[PDB]
Amino acid sequence: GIREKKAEYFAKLREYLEEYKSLFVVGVDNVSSQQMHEVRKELRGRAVVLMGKNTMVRRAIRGFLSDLPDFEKLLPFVKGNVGFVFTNEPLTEIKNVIVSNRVAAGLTVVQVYDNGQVFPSSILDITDEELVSHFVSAVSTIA
Amino acid sequence: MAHFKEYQVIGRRLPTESVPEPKLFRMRIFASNEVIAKSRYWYFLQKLHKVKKASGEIVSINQINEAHPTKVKNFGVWVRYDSRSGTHNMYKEIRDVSRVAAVETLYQDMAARHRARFRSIHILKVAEIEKTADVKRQYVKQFLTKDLKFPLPHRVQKSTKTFSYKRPSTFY
Amino acid sequence: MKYIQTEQQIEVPEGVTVSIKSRIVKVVGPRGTLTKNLKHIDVTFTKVNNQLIKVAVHNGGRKHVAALRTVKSLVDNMITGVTKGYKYKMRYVYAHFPINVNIVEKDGAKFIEVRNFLGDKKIRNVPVRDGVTIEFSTNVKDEIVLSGNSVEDVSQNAADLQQICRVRNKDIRKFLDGIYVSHKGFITEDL
Amino acid sequence: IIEPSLKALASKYNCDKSVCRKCYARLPPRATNCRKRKCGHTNQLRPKKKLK
Amino acid sequence: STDSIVKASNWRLVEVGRVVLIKKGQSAGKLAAIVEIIDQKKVLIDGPKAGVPRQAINLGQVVLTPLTFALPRGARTATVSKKWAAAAVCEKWAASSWAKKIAQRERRAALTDFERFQVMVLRKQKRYTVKKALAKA
RNA sequence: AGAACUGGCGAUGCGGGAUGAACCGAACGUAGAGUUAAGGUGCCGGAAUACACGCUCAUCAGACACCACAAAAGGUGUUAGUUCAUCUAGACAGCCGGACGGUGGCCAUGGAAGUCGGAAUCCGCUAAGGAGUGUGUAACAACUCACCGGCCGAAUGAACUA
RNA sequence: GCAGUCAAGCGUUCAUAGCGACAUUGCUUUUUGAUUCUUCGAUGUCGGCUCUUCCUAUCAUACCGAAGCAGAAUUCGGUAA
Ligand SMILES: [Mg+2]
Ligand SMILES: [Mg+2]
Ligand SMILES: [Mg+2]
Ligand SMILES: [Mg+2]
Ligand SMILES: [Mg+2]
Ligand SMILES: [Mg+2]
Ligand SMILES: [Mg+2]
Ligand SMILES: [Mg+2]
Ligand SMILES: [Mg+2]
Ligand SMILES: [Mg+2]
Ligand SMILES: [Mg+2]
Ligand SMILES: [Mg+2]
Ligand SMILES: [Mg+2]
Ligand SMILES: [Mg+2]
Ligand SMILES: [Mg+2]
Ligand SMILES: [Mg+2]
Ligand SMILES: [Mg+2]
Ligand SMILES: [Mg+2]
Ligand SMILES: [Mg+2]
Ligand SMILES: [Mg+2]
Ligand SMILES: [Mg+2]
Ligand SMILES: [Mg+2]
Ligand SMILES: [Mg+2]
Ligand SMILES: [Mg+2]
Ligand SMILES: [Mg+2]
Ligand SMILES: [Mg+2]
Ligand SMILES: [Mg+2]
Ligand SMILES: [Mg+2]
Ligand SMILES: [Mg+2]
Ligand SMILES: [Mg+2]
Ligand SMILES: [Mg+2]
Ligand SMILES: [Mg+2]
Ligand SMILES: [Mg+2]
Ligand SMILES: [Mg+2]
Ligand SMILES: [Mg+2]
Ligand SMILES: [Mg+2]
Ligand SMILES: [Mg+2]
Ligand SMILES: [Mg+2]
Ligand SMILES: [Mg+2]
Ligand SMILES: [Zn+2]
């Protein structure tokens, strides 16, 4: 029965790498059952999360290195308490739902997947404090 | 039973009317000389085919020397053996530098641990274990670690003379 | 199967030092100092550093290797006893005859003496080992409390007092009387 | 008399044990084998019979 | 001196590169080097420089010396030779009192009668000046 | 007690089995030198306190054919082995986190919400979380487990064989 | 004659506290037998009395473990001649 179950886990994972074109690796360290249940309710539309056991992920990824081999460089970010948030919406509306909603004494984000590229979740939340001057703080260099 | 040797023993049924040139069979045999080797060929050949040596002949005896006799290796040994109450199959590992060595200690071991004399033991198969960590039995596996080293505590030097004028030390 | 090497580890907490020579362990911490003669066991000690000492048994089999773990534990209780210390509580248990317990002494002795046990005219005496100290709880009825640096001398002294109260010739399921060890713990670090 | 928790204490010594069905030896309640060498370390234990 | 003092018993180890004095047999008196460990009582040794043939040996009939050098497990004779040379093992050996005592032992055994005689006459001469010195302080 | 074939004893010493009709070895003129047999070589006692790999610790060890006895039955002693099962899709153990929503589920009654107690044992959401393992409150709380996971890194459970 | 293994039963209930059937493994040599080796040119043939010593399969006495041991009484077992 454990041969059955595990097999299917790859299935509902292999089906989230083909569907969605981006992925958040979140760090659900602590973060109770209840809290994690409510982030499901607050992402019911676009996003979906899939919590997984590590040694089943690091192997299923490597075992999926056929098609979608870009996911290969996820592995060095799959340590610790991690989870998978798949989406198609922009960065700073899904990650803004995640990092914010529900906390006490909140789950974080550790990295971001995009078209075979990684984002430190910091260089995905630009406050336009260098995005404006990218054609302005050097535009005076042309005059 | 002494210092063991391995022998290729080859023999065939005697030729006849209907079968000029019958089929050759070969065994590898750990015995201590040729006379035993050939006898242990005919022992098994009675039990496998139904040849009696009276109606057969021994085409060749060749000593199979060890290929790399100064390369330590891990042998897997499969044994059928007879006990006071039953007859059983075994598998054990023996670490040594040669096939013939392995067998000697196999035969000693079977005799110390299970009280099995040479006669009550068929050697099924003896084969080098190519991939380490195919090694199954721990008493070998513990010699396979990286940078293995151990001491040899309490060393008892044998004395020549019967009296000694100093109280000895065991200090290796 | 004869194990080529097998070892154990002894964490040396801050404050205590431990010196070992010809297998005679000396252990000094805040509470004081304990020694043990482990010569009866072939174990070889090695100090990695003042925080951590290792214990090894070379080329030994089953039982020899079994002595290892117990040697570690012995050196451990030496340490915890010389830091947290040990404290066994007991309880007088009697259905009709109150058990009168006191400390008397003959030639600077210190015995635990026990009176009226099940209506007994006999006066029981348990010597108090050196290093173990006997106090009587003030907020727990009929308590008594032995404490000191070694579990061993404490535990024994407790068992010693509890043994002396065994009840002969009665169905000991009915006649539950005695003094039983009710708590085993430390002196520091709560109770 | 003797409050339930002291009865409970003195039972941990007097009543909550097992017996060897060969040599009557008083043994740990969760015991699997007898410690006494005379009964050949048998594992034929019983529980010490509980009172009324 | 408030340190933890643990008498750390210091054994000769059976390990690759541990060099050993062969005790009995055809290669008695020679130095070999442990190349690989067979089991708890058997090893594979090789002593190219000394002329001891690469063989399995029973750890019984060989004595571990304190000399140990750099050698990769299972090395063939040829490189066993290359590394021992590199290691200046023989040099270190002959430097030990263990080595020299063996040789002294060897030398006395060689003395002819006349030689033996002279040793007496010289021992006599050295004793004179020694008893003398002794009786002065 | 009585037959069968052969070899013995009887009629026969000698070496071995301490001892002994019959076993093992070997059969006998007076002797010398050598080599052996069966059997032995710690000491009594001639002859390795020889070499080598294991096994065994007995508050009733054991120690050699004939032969000077032991059985059914049993052992979580210890050794080797066998079979089934689990585990690199990460087990077992150890520590560490989470241990949820319908919902105080339904009857019941001073009250009883997972845990005095009758009847089931459904669902959602899940990586997982029992209409509940126990501790606990008058009843909630609170703690706790089963379940899942973070780490560790290669072994683990059960039945057996001799 | 004595002691085990099994556990159907007995024991309100409950195999084994104490028992234990149908079967089965043993031990003993104070029973009786079987044999006829020793003694028939001779080993005085029952009981008791007297006295010593030995065995232990323990009746009492010492100390324990167990119970269908509340107490008293008893019963089962250990170390014990
Ligand atoms: Mg058979
Ligand atoms: Mg056979
Ligand atoms: Mg009693
Ligand atoms: Mg009574
Ligand atoms: Mg207890
Ligand atoms: Mg006894
Ligand atoms: Mg005959
Ligand atoms: Mg006649
Ligand atoms: Mg004759
Ligand atoms: Mg005899
Ligand atoms: Mg014959
Ligand atoms: Mg004598
Ligand atoms: Mg002699
Ligand atoms: Mg013992
Ligand atoms: Mg026989
Ligand atoms: Mg066994
Ligand atoms: Mg297999
Ligand atoms: Mg382990
Ligand atoms: Mg915890
Ligand atoms: Mg937990
Ligand atoms: Mg309820
Ligand atoms: Mg309740
Ligand atoms: Mg609650
Ligand atoms: Mg089998
Ligand atoms: Mg009953
Ligand atoms: Mg009944
Ligand atoms: Mg009865
Ligand atoms: Mg007669
Ligand atoms: Mg007469
Ligand atoms: Mg007379
Ligand atoms: Mg007369
Ligand atoms: Mg007796
Ligand atoms: Mg007793
Ligand atoms: Mg009852
Ligand atoms: Mg009564
Ligand atoms: Mg009465
Ligand atoms: Mg009565
Ligand atoms: Mg009885
Ligand atoms: Mg007497
Ligand atoms: Zn018992």
Swiss-Prot record, chain A:
The modification Phosphoserine is found at S66. Residues 121-143 are annotated as: Interaction with P1A-P2B. It is found in: Cytoplasm. There is a cross-link at K12, K95 (Glycyl lysine isopeptide (Lys-Gly) (interchain with G-Cter in ubiquitin)). It comes from the Eukaryota. Component of the large ribosomal subunit (LSU). Mature yeast ribosomes consist of a small (40S) and a large (60S) subunit. The 40S small subunit contains 1 molecule of ribosomal RNA (18S rRNA) and 33 different proteins (encoded by 57 genes). The large 60S subunit contains 3 rRNA molecules (25S, 5.8S and 5S rRNA) and 46 different proteins (encoded by 81 genes). The 5 acidic ribosomal P-proteins form the stalk structure of the 60S subunit. They are organized as a pentameric complex in which uL10/P0 interacts with 2 heterodimers, P1A-P2B and P1B-P2A. uL10 directly interacts with 28S rRNA. Belongs to the universal ribosomal protein uL10 family. Component of the ribosome, a large ribonucleoprotein complex responsible for the synthesis of proteins in the cell. The small ribosomal subunit (SSU) binds messenger RNAs (mRNAs) and translates the encoded message by selecting cognate aminoacyl-transfer RNA (tRNA) molecules. The large subunit (LSU) contains the ribosomal catalytic site termed the peptidyl transferase center (PTC), which catalyzes the formation of peptide bonds, thereby polymerizing the amino acids delivered by tRNAs into a polypeptide chain. This is Large ribosomal subunit protein uL10. The chain holds residues 3 to 221 of 312 of the full protein.
Swiss-Prot record, chain B:
One of its GO terms (molecular function) is structural constituent of ribosome. GO terms for cellular component: cytosol; cytosolic large ribosomal subunit. One of its GO terms (biological process) is cytoplasmic translation. Pfam families: Ribosomal_L18A (PF01775). It is found in: Cytoplasm. Keywords: Cytoplasm, Isopeptide bond, Phosphoprotein, Ribonucleoprotein, Ribosomal protein, Ubl conjugation. Transmembrane segments: none annotated. InterPro entries: Ribosomal_eL20, Ribosomal_eL20_dom, Ribosomal_eL20_eukaryotes. The modification Phosphoserine is found at S32. Component of the large ribosomal subunit (LSU). Mature yeast ribosomes consist of a small (40S) and a large (60S) subunit. The 40S small subunit contains 1 molecule of ribosomal RNA (18S rRNA) and 33 different proteins (encoded by 57 genes). The large 60S subunit contains 3 rRNA molecules (25S, 5.8S and 5S rRNA) and 46 different proteins (encoded by 81 genes). eL20 forms multiple interactions with RNA and proteins in the central protuberance, connecting components of core functional centers that are located far apart. This is Large ribosomal subunit protein eL20A. It comes from Saccharomyces cerevisiae (strain ATCC 204508 / S288c).
Swiss-Prot record, chain D:
Disulfide bonds: none annotated. Component of the large ribosomal subunit (LSU). Mature yeast ribosomes consist of a small (40S) and a large (60S) subunit. The 40S small subunit contains 1 molecule of ribosomal RNA (18S rRNA) and 33 different proteins (encoded by 57 genes). The large 60S subunit contains 3 rRNA molecules (25S, 5.8S and 5S rRNA) and 46 different proteins (encoded by 81 genes). Component of the ribosome, a large ribonucleoprotein complex responsible for the synthesis of proteins in the cell. The small ribosomal subunit (SSU) binds messenger RNAs (mRNAs) and translates the encoded message by selecting cognate aminoacyl-transfer RNA (tRNA) molecules. The large subunit (LSU) contains the ribosomal catalytic site termed the peptidyl transferase center (PTC), which catalyzes the formation of peptide bonds, thereby polymerizing the amino acids delivered by tRNAs into a polypeptide chain. It is found in: Cytoplasm. There is a cross-link at K17 (Glycyl lysine isopeptide (Lys-Gly) (interchain with G-Cter in ubiquitin)). This is Large ribosomal subunit protein eL40A.
Curated annotation (Swiss-Prot), chain E:
One of its GO terms (molecular function) is structural constituent of ribosome. It is found in: Cytoplasm. Component of the ribosome, a large ribonucleoprotein complex responsible for the synthesis of proteins in the cell. The small ribosomal subunit (SSU) binds messenger RNAs (mRNAs) and translates the encoded message by selecting cognate aminoacyl-transfer RNA (tRNA) molecules. The large subunit (LSU) contains the ribosomal catalytic site termed the peptidyl transferase center (PTC), which catalyzes the formation of peptide bonds, thereby polymerizing the amino acids delivered by tRNAs into a polypeptide chain. Keywords: Acetylation, Cytoplasm, Ribonucleoprotein, Ribosomal protein. GO terms for biological process: cytoplasmic translation; macroautophagy; maturation of LSU-rRNA; ribosomal large subunit assembly; ribosomal large subunit biogenesis. N-terminally acetylated by acetyltransferase NatA. Belongs to the eukaryotic ribosomal protein eL14 family. The modification N-acetylserine is found at S1. GO terms for cellular component: cytosol; cytosolic large ribosomal subunit; nucleolus. Transmembrane segments: none annotated. This is Large ribosomal subunit protein eL14A. The gene is RPL14A. Pfam families: KOW, Ribosomal_L14e. InterPro entries: KOW, Rib_uL2_dom2, Ribosomal_eL14, Ribosomal_eL14_dom, Translation_prot_SH3-like_sf. Present with 45300 molecules/cell in log phase SD medium.
